[model samples]
Target: MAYFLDFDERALKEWRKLGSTVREQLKKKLVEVLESPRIEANKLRGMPDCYKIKLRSSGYRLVYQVIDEKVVVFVISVGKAEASEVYSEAVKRIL
Candidate 1:
């Protein structure tokens, strides 16, 4: 089964910065997280709980958390990143 969707205030804020069109484009992947979430070796590495969904078209990164115990998925961060070195730093500070 999939988890329920939730968002961090900061993540929602950054996503809002993408504006309506881009935000609509990214919404699909957000739904993907609701189905299945797993990230690359980027910001999600050290944090085994969070998943990363990178949208190559929009050049954005969606960082999320899946808590099996709670049956909920929390979107922790969203934005751009070239390397894990980039957003991973943000993940460290935030998570």
Candidate 2:
């Protein structure tokens, strides 16, 4: 089964910064991640099921939870720096 994705205020802003074509690319990419999270290695293995994926093209990170196999994108925080710490904090919300 596949799940839908969402973008909060923060994610929206980051998306806005991209050009139209890039934004379309990001949408397409997010769909790919939602449908096949196993494609990415277990970046969130320790957080009681953190389904994290690196959002494509932009290299920004999205950390979300899969509820009963349905996706609920929780955090879309972005930065030029790698977001390992951001992912760590976002996953902590699961507990």
Candidate 3:
């Protein structure tokens, strides 16, 4: 049930940039996100169930929601690229 990182659209370009290999890795990481922590700073922290991942070295942000029992991640915004402007826009697009 994966969609956009934030709005489910920003990921298109970022996915393209990452290529199949990286995208697959991202998908794997997303699944892993489900089993990780459910911290207060997670995707929707104070909500029912939401989570995200800040990549260890790269500082990438993966925002996602858990629908049913599955984890759905929307690579809301990727940093270190058009990081500033893109992240700003992504946050505005989300609810």
Candidate 4:
């Protein structure tokens, strides 16, 4: 059961900007999310469909949505967790 993986334009750009080690970690996390998207408690409040996953050490956030019907995981944004503004920005895309 291979699910479709996708990224929004901003997400693609952010992913390309990652360093080698960070990119590797991101790949690991991506596989984890794909395998068990609901196992983690990262779903956002007031935005039930939007979710987030964190890097082990980085403050960056991986904001995404899991479309079960389409079998698609859409990574919509990448932003630093320290910046509240980043989440607000992500909310725009999420909505």
Residue 20's lDDT in candidate 2: 72
- Taking the tens digit of each residue's C-alpha lDDT, what string does model 4 give over 11-89? 7777888766776776677787787665448877776566787777665677777777788878777655676654665
Question: Which tens-of-lDDT digit does each residue in 1-95 have in candidate 3?
Answer: 23322325665677567545555655667665545444455655443454555555455555545444433444555434334555454456556
How much does candidate 1 score in TM-score? 0.73
lDDT against the true structure, each candidate: 0.67, 0.55, 0.51, 0.72
Off by over 4 Å in 1: 38-43, 83-95
Q: Tell how far residue 60 is off in model 1, in angstroms.
A: 0.6
Best by lDDT: 4
Give me the runs in candidate 4 sitting further than 4 Å from their true place: none
| lDDT tens readout by residue for model 1, 46-78 | 576777776767677777777666788777777
Give the better candidate number (1 or 3) by lDDT: 1
Residue-level error in angstroms, candidate 2, position 95:
5.1
Ranking by lDDT: 4, 1, 2, 3
Please, what are the lDDT tens digits per residue for candidate 2 over residues 16-90? 875676567556656776666444473466665555555456565555555444556444443333736656445
Query: Clashing pairs in model 4?
Result: none
Ranked by TM-score, the better of candidates 1 and 3 is 1
* TM-scores, each model vs. reference: 0.73, 0.56, 0.49, 0.80
Residue-pair clash count for candidate 4: 0
Flag the better candidate by lDDT, 1 or 2: 1
